Design a protein around this ligand. Sequence first.
Ligand SMILES: [Zn+2]
Ligand SMILES: [Zn+2]
Ligand SMILES: [Zn+2]
Lengths: 137, 230, 49, 147, 56, 65, 119, 228, 56
Amino acid sequence: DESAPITAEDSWAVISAFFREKGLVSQQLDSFNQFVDYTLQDIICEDSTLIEISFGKIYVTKPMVNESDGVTHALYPQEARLRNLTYSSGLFVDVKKRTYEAIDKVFIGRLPIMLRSKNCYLSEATESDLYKLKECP
Amino acid sequence: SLMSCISVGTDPMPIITFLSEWGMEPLEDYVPHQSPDATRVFVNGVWHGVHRNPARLMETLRTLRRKGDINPEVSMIRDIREKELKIFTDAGRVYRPLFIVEDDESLGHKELKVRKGHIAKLMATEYQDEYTWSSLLNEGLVEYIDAEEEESILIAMQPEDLEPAEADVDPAKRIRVSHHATTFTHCEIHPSMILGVAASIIPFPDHNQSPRNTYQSAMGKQAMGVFLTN
Amino acid sequence: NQEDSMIMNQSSIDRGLFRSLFFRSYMDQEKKYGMSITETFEKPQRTNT
Amino acid sequence: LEPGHAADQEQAKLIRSAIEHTTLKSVTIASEIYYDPDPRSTVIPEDEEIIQLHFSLQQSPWLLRLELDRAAMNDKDLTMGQVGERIKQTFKNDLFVIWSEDNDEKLIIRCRVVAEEDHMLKKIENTMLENITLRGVENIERVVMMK
Amino acid sequence: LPHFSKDDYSPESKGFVENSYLRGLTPQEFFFHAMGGREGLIDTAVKTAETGYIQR
Amino acid sequence: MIVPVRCFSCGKVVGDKWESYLNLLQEDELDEGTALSRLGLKRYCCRRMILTHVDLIEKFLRYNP
Amino acid sequence: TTFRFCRDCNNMLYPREDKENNRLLFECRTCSYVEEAGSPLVYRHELITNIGETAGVVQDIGSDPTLPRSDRECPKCHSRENVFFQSQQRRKDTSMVLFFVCLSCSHIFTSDQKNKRTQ
Amino acid sequence: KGSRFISTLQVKLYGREGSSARTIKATLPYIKQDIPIVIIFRALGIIPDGEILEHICYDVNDWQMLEMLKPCVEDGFVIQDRETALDFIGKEKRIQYAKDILQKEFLPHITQLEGFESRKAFFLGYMINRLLLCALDRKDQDDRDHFGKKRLDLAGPLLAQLFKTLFKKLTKDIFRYMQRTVELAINAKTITSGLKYALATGNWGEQKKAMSSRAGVSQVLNRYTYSS
Amino acid sequence: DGPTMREITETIAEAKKKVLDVTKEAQANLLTAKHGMTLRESFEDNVVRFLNEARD
RNA sequence: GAGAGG
DNA sequence: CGATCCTCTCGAT
Ligand SMILES: [Zn+2]
Ligand SMILES: [Zn+2]
Ligand SMILES: [Zn+2]
């Protein structure tokens, strides 16, 4: 029956559900994904505004490389690991140049990306894509 | 340990609003001699107010977290004897999942919420590699617990071997005590989950002098294999 | 095989038992700074050196 | 113990109580301050029998009343008379001490001071409990008999 | 442990391993043995750096 | 990483038996123990050789270079 | 001890003897209020304390899943539905004695065979 | 969220067990001596002894606890209003300084805003209650080894520390550039290298190292076996 | 042996009863403490001896 | 400086 | 002003 109590063997089905969903490093990923998705915007909106330069929405690009005498392109971890590069994404914010009048977009820098997080290429990569990217599934 | 997670952090503000909306006298308006049997309500170490019928409030708070209306990582601890309700939404709290145990048919007489039907759906999804971990969580069959909440609960170690009924033995088998407590709220998914990555490799660590398991844990990291396919 | 030693079979070692590959990567780059001053990857000979 | 005389289980118990530091705090259940204005007429009905006696073989309307533990008094080698005469040989004339018999159901010691009186008594009780040696040697907390 | 009821002074409750390494230990027994085990490694680590200083 | 040729312990040639073993399992739908016995892997040293082998070469061949 | 406050100030009342009539009165030192004492007991210490043994006995007590349940019969109603604990007095020299709360009465009864109790 | 001012309030019970006249004094930030509790309540607007004791003792029949607080009532007797209570702490200008500490420095969680006094006085009283419960041997000393009372900081919180620091430096660098413009040039390298340095080294304190944040946060990642 | 195990099993159950009887006695306020030690210290000392005896 | 070995 | 010995490897300034 579908309403019958579960036995001790049944616990592994649950254990497989967990892990199939979380994997083994969820704490790492969950923390970073929270930092990128929420914390990052919150830091930008704290003391921010000046005397008037305001800071709006923050954007996190997918990881790229600024090539010396070259163009900017997608940086994958295997190329980062081999060429001694930092697997990082660019931080871009909306800056308003509000000028007093009666009283009385912009690149911030590069954020290192955690591998297999939302902003990382590998997060949505299939098994065939991983081998193609010289990354172990 | 294998199944433990860490709280990410949730804004406490909607909980505070809900508490003031679902009872809760504000602290400014508290007069102890005229509210003697009132539960003190704390949200992230801040005492917000008091409540008369914390039993109903606590039932409401748990139902919502089990639906997903309150984030599953939020911990709500009721200390009946101390007249305190403590809620934590903050990051850093190490928690672990547990099966929920509840009364079924007769007020007594607990049963795990997960039934064979749920397991079948779990395994259906396994064979097509639909019903995931989030399904168990959102349907409130399983639930996250941190050490603070662990204090208010009674956990059975096995589903069967901890709650069927009483009315020969294998001499070879190890000695197990009994029910001796039958007021369970939860049950362990599987005791081997108390172990982390390294110790999970040891065969029968329950048959070894403890420091040997600590020693193996160290050496397993010094054993060469195939670290990565690439 | 006393006081924590062990006796291993040579014949099974000949067949590959517990045999392993070992890899070591050595790294280098041409300099750190110098507008005109640059280190060079080459096979060096005399040149006063 | 004495070379004799060291097999004597009784002589050992005696030397134990002779050396183990015993204060008033260690024998007392509670201490109370009542307003018993008539010195020869109690407001406390239990104490009535004590006041009948202690007249043959000025004071304060404030009473300092201590209740002692029958078992603790028996663990130590103490009698009410010993505890009482020890309180008596501290303040001598500046405090008046009366007490219940050793057989008398509840162990009670009644004290009185021989304007601004109320505080002085609460001060005395502190010295009574904390700063009074009933028997024993200072620094010697616990003494155990061993074969 | 949260598998016991409050105020339980019984052997099983306070760390008595009824079983042998042959029979095998229960989770409660397993955890408690690990607790006892740890105290040993902690002082091993201390009764080396401390004795080394004594010896000097 | 590819079937060892020869059992480490006894020397019995095992490197010619892998594909036949996979077929015995898949095509004939036999159990590992009877599959091993049909291959003539009678002793346990020869049995651990095949049953315990992990063919990572398949994983390695997946890398595009 | 049981103390009182100035009906108007809500400040603690300090003792004062009459002397002439030999009576105890409690006076406020924030104003001119004066009431008589209800009992001569002006102070109590208590070194061997019984207070806090049975603490946490709330109507919701039975709903605590961690509290153990005995097979004992309540001396009042004869209910065998109870919850129990040892002295909540977190002191070294405390008794191993059990206190039971009848989950049907609210009645607190003890395992103690020596002492009685008044609660 | 919003800065991280860690002020530790200490509510201390003076006088040993067996010493008559045991007083309760609290510690305030930027305040020389320890303030007797009654004086704190009066500075918060809770004046009558009965109201002050109601904020501490939550049961009228607990004479034991009320007898514990009798010396406090006596210690505070000389102060009978808010103005003088604030005055005691820390001219005129000093009363403001005292009022300021109570809102800004005293119990910064709860709130750092103006009108809340009741919230702070109740909590302060909750702490005295908790202190007396233990002092009266009804409660065990708090277990500073309980995992529930411990938080584990991961990647997110750790980067959030640095990104706050580095972003304030960037904010500061912009203001300076704006100030010079008394008659587009945003130093991106600041964040980029700051984040890189911390993750590159163990040193989690922005090229300073002075703080034990260096401890070994960020390690070169073990790759011996898959398990390691 | 099967028989040795049975005897070991019963050796432990009798130790388990000694601890119960002592517990029941402690909880009845019948257990008197020896001069120099607490009723609870006295109990703990007894329980541990019964339990060590059992292992031995 | 960290990670490790007896 | 003390805080085992010796041994290794690594990365970074
Ligand atoms: Zn072979
Ligand atoms: Zn008044
Ligand atoms: Zn009843």
